[PDB]
Every structure is written in structure tokens, then in C-alpha cells.
Design a protein around this ligand. Structure first.
Ligand code: HEM
Ligand code: HEM
Ligand SMILES: [Cl-]
Ligand SMILES: [Cl-]
Lengths: 178, 180
């Protein structure tokens, strides 16, 4: 997992569950409580799991619920770290550029394993967006979309169109109705 | 020196002087011309000094001039590798966070010499910035500042106030005048 992203997660966790829950979770995997993760670093995805497992144990929330909440809230954190992605833009525009954005933010990191997020028009008033990744981060994905709707003040309708697992890759396709 | 930084230099050096000069400079120190430096690796400063010494010989450029040019061009490289450090930000913002950023980027390293780059506003349209380091990379520092101005498209005047050892530490104090 890319450093900058995990950095946004720590902040978002603090925003959601408080400094003590987070400080404690970070210590449990052996980090400094106030560690600042830099864009440079590569965080073991299993360390992330364990941090999140601790958060779950401390809050009493199921880990998948944590991911959902982290997804919704992280949009807000993004809008502060990367304001140009949000400024003078519509939700549709935002969602549609996402696939490109993730290629851009990842492409001196090899092996570059960024999630695919191709969005397409499938009628006059809606998109299909397909998440594709070995990581199987469905709740996070759905959370971010809810967070984007929240952020742009645009109520949307989200329905799962299909799901799949092949050759190591997981996929989830949804229909987003404005 | 932090491995990833050296990564940026190799790229920048290719952009400036071409693959042949870079390929050969790397080989002169027993490297593979295409070596990729992981975020885990640290590179010995002397290996860096030697690489740059070959670039100097090959291009016929004085090495301080090389450092100057690399500093200027490395900002562009940085902007491609570390977008988050540039995102939604202006020159003054960028410059003044630099000291903290450098501490953060080396904090995971055992014995930690990052340059210090304390800035402070000294007037309406000016900050003072002091480079402090054992490494004495004066031209690189100046280059990065110049490169930043070009990148953030914000014109500045750079007055070099003082430069010298004081002590054990090389020091370079600049006053950076913004138009506005
Ligand atoms: C400006 C807004 C956003 C920024 C700057 C951003 C950036 C990033 C970055 C740098 C990563 C790390 C990727 C890697 O290391 O492979 C990531 C991961 C991820 N991104 Fe975003 N993202 C944004 C919004 C979104 C949105 C709107 C979605 C979906 C609707 C999304 C979906 C995901 C998912 C699911 C991951 C986890 C990686 C995986 O599952 O393979 N992101 N994001
Ligand atoms: C995103 C932008 C930047 C990044 C990611 C970055 C990162 C780094 C890193 C990781 C090092 C290695 C330090 C070590 O291993 O001890 C370094 C060295 C250095 N940095 Fe930066 N830097 C950035 C911008 C700047 C700027 C704008 C300046 C000056 C205004 C600067 C000044 C220097 C200098 C002069 C060195 C040489 C090391 C020394 O003299 O001791 N950097 N930089
Ligand atoms: Cl995970
Ligand atoms: Cl050197």
C-alpha cells in the first residue's frame, strides 16, 4: 500500500475514532504512535490489516464496517491533501477521472498495482463503475463513493450490478444513479 | 543518502545529460546501468560523489555547475514522484514545510543526517531560509530553490546572505524576496 494513502488513513482514523484508539493501534504493530507516513514509503498490507483489526477490537465495530466508514470519511481527508482534484468539479466528473488519477499517483511505483476504476455511461443519467483489484476492498470502495456523494452534496443511487473473482483479481461493478 | 533521492538524481541526470553519460557513470562504480533503487535502500555518499565525478568528466562541466543544474531540474522530477508535496500549494508554503518534510523522510533511518532548512518570514514579501548540513551541497540547495520558482511560476529574488562552515556544519543563509 502506498505511503501517501496509508497516511490519509491514519488521519481519517483519528478523525473517526480518536487519538487514543489510533495511538494504541499503531503501537500494537510496533510503530511510533505519532509516526508520519511519507509518500516515499511502502506499507506492508498485513501491517494495515493488523492496525485495522486492533481498531475493530477497540471500537467493537466489525472490520468491514470500519472500512466503509473510513471510505466515506477519507474523501474529506483527500479534499484537504489534494484540493485540485475537487475544486470546480462535479461528482460525475470526479468519479469519471478516478481511474486516471490512480494511474497518475502510482506510476513510478513498480510493481504498480493500482485499483482499476473505469467508469462508463450506460444511459443518459447514469454510470457503471467497475472496481478491479487483487485487494478485494469492496467496503472501502463503496465507502469512498458514498463519501464523494456526501462531499459534493449530490444524492445518488448505488446498486451492485456484478461481482467476481478470477486469476487472483477481484471485481465489483456498480450502477450509480443521479 | 536516501536511496530514493538518488533514484531521482539518476532520472534527472538522464533528462539533463543523456542515457550514455549516465549509463557509463553508473558502471564506473560497479553498478548496473539500469539499477532500480528501492525505498528501503540507502546509498553511500561517496558512491554519489564518484558518480557525479564521472558525469563531470564526461560532460566537461564543473561538478558544482552539475549540482546547480540537477537542483533546478530535480524539482520537476520530485513533482512527478511526490505529487502530494506540491498539490494545492504555493511557493512559500512549499519552502517553509521543507525542514519538517526532510525530518519526516529520514525519521525511519538509523543515524539521521538530513539537511536542516529552517525558514522564517522576515518581512511582508520575504522569508529567510538557512541550509545547514555536514554535506556542503550549496549549489544543489540553490538549484532546488531556483527550480521551485520556475515550477510554481512565482518570481523571486535570491539574496545570498552568508555561506561558510560554522561549524562542522556548512551553512547557507538566503533571503528570498517575493514580488508580492
Ligand atoms: C482525490 C481523490 C483520491 C485520491 C487522491 C486517491 C488516491 C489513492 C491512492 C494513491 C491509492 C493507493 C493505490 C496503490 O497503492 O495501489 C488509492 C487506493 C484506493 N483507491 Fe483511491 N483515491 C481517491 C479517490 C478514490 C475514489 C473516489 C475511489 C472509488 C470510488 C477510490 C478507490 C480506491 C480503492 C478501493 C483503493 C485501495 C487499493 C485497492 O483496492 O487495490 N479512490 N487511492
Ligand atoms: C518534494 C520535495 C522534496 C523531497 C521529497 C526531498 C527529499 C529529500 C531527501 C529524502 C533527501 C535525503 C536526505 C538524507 O538522506 O540525508 C534530500 C536531501 C536534500 N534536500 Fe531535499 N527534498 C525536496 C525538496 C527540497 C528543497 C526545495 C530543498 C531546498 C530548498 C531541498 C534541499 C535538500 C538538500 C540541499 C539535500 C542534500 C542533503 C544535504 O545537503 O545534507 N530539498 N531531499
Ligand atoms: Cl488490508
Ligand atoms: Cl556528495
Amino acid at each position: 500500500m502506498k505511503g501517501t494513502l496509508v497516511g490519509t488513513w491514519i488521519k481519517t482514523l483519528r478523525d473517526l475514532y480518536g487519538n487514543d484508539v489510533v495511538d494504541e493501534s499503531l503501537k500494537s504493530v510496533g510503530w511510533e504512535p505519532d509516526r508520519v507516513i511519507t509518500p516515499l514509503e511502502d506499507i506492508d498490507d498485513d501491517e494495515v490489516r493488523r492496525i485495522f483489526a486492533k481498531v475493530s477490537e477497540k471500537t467493537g465495530k466489525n472490520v468491514n464496517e470500519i472500512w466503509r466508514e473510513v471510505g466515506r470519511q477519507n474523501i474529506k481527508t483527500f479534499s484537504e491533501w489534494f484540493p485540485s482534484y475537487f475544486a470546480g468539479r462535479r461528482l460525475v466528473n470526479f468519479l469519471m477521472m478516478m481511474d486516471e488519477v490512480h494511474l497518475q499517483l502510482t506510476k513510478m511505483i513498480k510493481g504498480a498495482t493500482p485499483p482499476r476504476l473505469i467508469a462508463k455511461p450506460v444511459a443518459k443519467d447514469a454510470i457503471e463503475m467497475e472496481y478491479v483489484s487483487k485487494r478485494k476492498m469492496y467496503d472501502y470502495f463503496l465507502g469512498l463513493i458514498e463519501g464523494s456523494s456526501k462531499f459534493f452534496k449530490e444524492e445518488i443511487s448505488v446498486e451492485e450490478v456484478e461481482r467476481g473473482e478470477k486469476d487472483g483479481f477481484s471485481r465489483l461493478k456498480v450502477r450509480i444513479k443521479f
